[PDB]
């Protein structure tokens, strides 16, 4: 039976450490980190997600405030509120909850947030720094996956890693970090040999890559199935949980083969929220330094 | 034997197209695109090649020579003046620059609109989210060679050797990405990125499994005949002085279906794509 990579319990460990580190930094003469989460509409799932971010902020000592807007807000109104938060020195981090209406161009929204306050790390400047393997604000779900590997002592250096999914918000940043060079200034250097599989990878080729992989990360929103015959004995399987939501792994059979595996549910959600808190603390420190 | 992918001849074909499209654009009331290349120290030959292709296609190029003991602030003040110079459409710094010079700061000092090399973090960030951008020229050369030589990429197994921020990373980015996205440069291949810490056994296994190998490490004789799948396409981006590439050329040519030689392969295509990028930037600035 594989070791369980329980992201919920790890997130608790991380949130406890963050609580202490934030208090120490505040005690040097700093204001506690602040985050503003913009919510557009009344999607009940988007409100659950924002409440989770707020509850974790309270736990670690970050001051969070939710700004609710109506589904009919115009793009010009949303960008106007972001630019106001950009210029407000009492705000360290800005998030936009990511089901925004079809009226609004998501790309313009991501790039309107000041990079220094872009807790989601989706601004092109932050993505650019990630991809040249430079210190930046890294997207939280990708950072969560990387943190699960590091905290569970999963060997990446020179190992074969397959990432199933190339999404710009999740799959691409995961692959980029997995093949980072440790020596570079970024320091998020895992040095794995990474194969990026995606919606057009043929089934038989995907299975061959998976059979030779030491690590498989399923990040795609399209239905994939990792079966036991795709898994190298002792390999590490992380299901990111992108998808209402479903699981991408034949857990019962793959657990008999894999060396380490995400449970069902995987806790990647709680890990993502903990990494958002990490990013808010990181941003607050950078701004205080500059 | 392998099909020899004649990059010199393809580059000439592209440069003749550019010459015509630039002249047509100029005739609408526009000034010819201008480029300033900054070189620090001695060796320049690359810059001779850049300036020769610029003259061929109708781009006005000037080279700015600086002695090797220039400081960062001086180099950055030189770039700033060129940013504000409305007669200059494109700026390049001939890297390598001395170690006292921080490359990242210099890359981000060029105005993104004039950054012909595509190394500004804004241009790189747009590349990585599949937006139209100024694409690094060697990476764009590789993608254009795959298209013009009709090398199938959709769902194919590809290996990129090398992670360099200027070459290896953008190649792997475009090669695996979705062509439906706004940039339209994605090639929808399955891509394995191998690098200096890939163990030798696993490197050879990925190479033997690949339909396309793109190597940009600068390690001569890295790719051997027993590492190549029969019929595979071999794109050799490396250029080392012993000018050789990363591939054992005469032996791999017996197994591969298609191969780029060194010299005469990616090199001339890089220069042609630099001219493509200069024309692109001049058009964007006139339209803005």
Residue numbers in the entry:
A (entry chain B): 1 to 243, 253 to 299
B (entry chain A): 1 to 43, 47 to 245, 254 to 299
Give excerpts from the publication:
Our findings provide insight into the mechanism underlying the activity of MTHFD from B. mori and potentially other insects and may therefore facilitate the development of inhibitors specific to MTHFD as insecticides.
The bmMTHFD structure was determined at a resolution of 1.75 Å by X‐ray crystallography.
